[PDB]
Amino acid sequence: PSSQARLEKEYFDQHFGPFFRTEQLIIRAPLTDKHIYQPYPSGADVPFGPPLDIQILHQVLDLQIAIENITASYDNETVTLQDICLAPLSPYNTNCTILSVLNYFQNSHSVLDHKKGDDFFVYADYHTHFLYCVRAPASLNDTSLLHDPCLGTFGGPVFPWLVLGGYDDQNYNNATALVITFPVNNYYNDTEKLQRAQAWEKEFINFVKNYKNPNLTISFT
């Protein structure tokens, strides 16, 4: 939509550009049904869009992690994402900036699966953490689920309209698409590094095009 596109462009221009371009993937799960979450112990049903299914989320996290570990050969050298990414905490923490709904779950399979309850009921899980985080992306403490943070170790709040698409109004839980975005240095003032970055981007494009997961359709822009 035009409104969301305007919001994203303003966010990327402020927080990444002019030194960084953005790589962006749109991920859908067209063969996955939407579902209904029923809060414990009672509460109105909360609809969740197709790609917010827990198995789809694990599969998208695997896609994200795979992307971070892509390398490219250039002049017999190995070029990594960490060479060309935005890494605010370097040299301490050399992790790259990469935005997705998995950011709300520390980009972790185990955290995504966090839950509490008894032998019969689950009291809280990723559903309630999601609903909380899309209303308070800057929170470092979800009291209803084990004090798990929404906000990541660096980068500032991840607004849901950066990482979700296809919902109605501002009902983010009805998202029909996931968005993965990460900045890559344009190296406007260094031809050698620019050529290496382009070698990485070319391998990324090829990676995406050859990615095999029957549950996901991945597209660019």
From Swiss-Prot:
Output this protein's name.
Answer: NPC intracellular cholesterol transporter 1
Q: What is the effect of changing residue 123 to A?
A: Loss of interaction with ebolavirus glycoprotein
Disease entry from the Swiss-Prot or TrEMBL record: Niemann-Pick disease C1: A lysosomal storage disorder that affects the viscera and the central nervous system. It is due to defective intracellular processing and transport of low-density lipoprotein derived cholesterol. It causes accumulation of cholesterol in lysosomes, with delayed induction of cholesterol homeostatic reactions. Niemann-Pick disease type C1 has a highly variable clinical phenotype. Clinical features include variable hepatosplenomegaly and severe progressive neurological dysfunction such as ataxia, dystonia and dementia.
* Outcome following mutation: residue 135 to Q: In NPC1; late infantile form; Common in Japanese
According to its UniProt record, which protein family does this protein belong to?
A: Belongs to the patched family.
Residues bearing carbohydrate: 69, 76, 95, 141, 174, 189, 215
- Free-text function comment from the UniProt entry: Intracellular cholesterol transporter which acts in concert with NPC2 and plays an important role in the egress of cholesterol from the endosomal/lysosomal compartment. Unesterified cholesterol that has been released from LDLs in the lumen of the late endosomes/lysosomes is transferred by NPC2 to the cholesterol-binding pocket in the N-terminal domain of NPC1. Cholesterol binds to NPC1 with the hydroxyl group buried in the binding pocket. Binds oxysterol with higher affinity than cholesterol.
Q: Changing residue 120 to A/G: reported impact? A: Loss of interaction with ebolavirus glycoprotein
Q: How does it assemble?
A: Interacts (via the second lumenal domain) with NPC2. Interacts with TMEM97; the interaction may decrease NPC1 availability to the cell. Interacts with TIM1. Interacts with SLC38A9; this interaction inhibits cholesterol-mediated mTORC1 activation via its sterol transport activity. (Microbial infection) Interacts with ebolavirus glycoprotein.
> Which Cys-Cys disulfides exist here?
85-96, 133-150
Lumenal topological intervals: 1-221
Domain commentary: A cysteine-rich N-terminal domain and a C-terminal domain containing a di-leucine motif necessary for lysosomal targeting are critical for mobilization of cholesterol from lysosomes.
Whole-protein residues included:
384 to 604 of 1278
Q: How is it modified after translation?
A: N-glycosylated.
| Effect after changing residue 135 to W | In NPC1; decreased affinity for NPC2; decreased cholesterol transfer from NPC2 to NPC1
As for subcellular location, the record says:
Late endosome membrane; Lysosome membrane
Gene that encodes the chain? NPC1
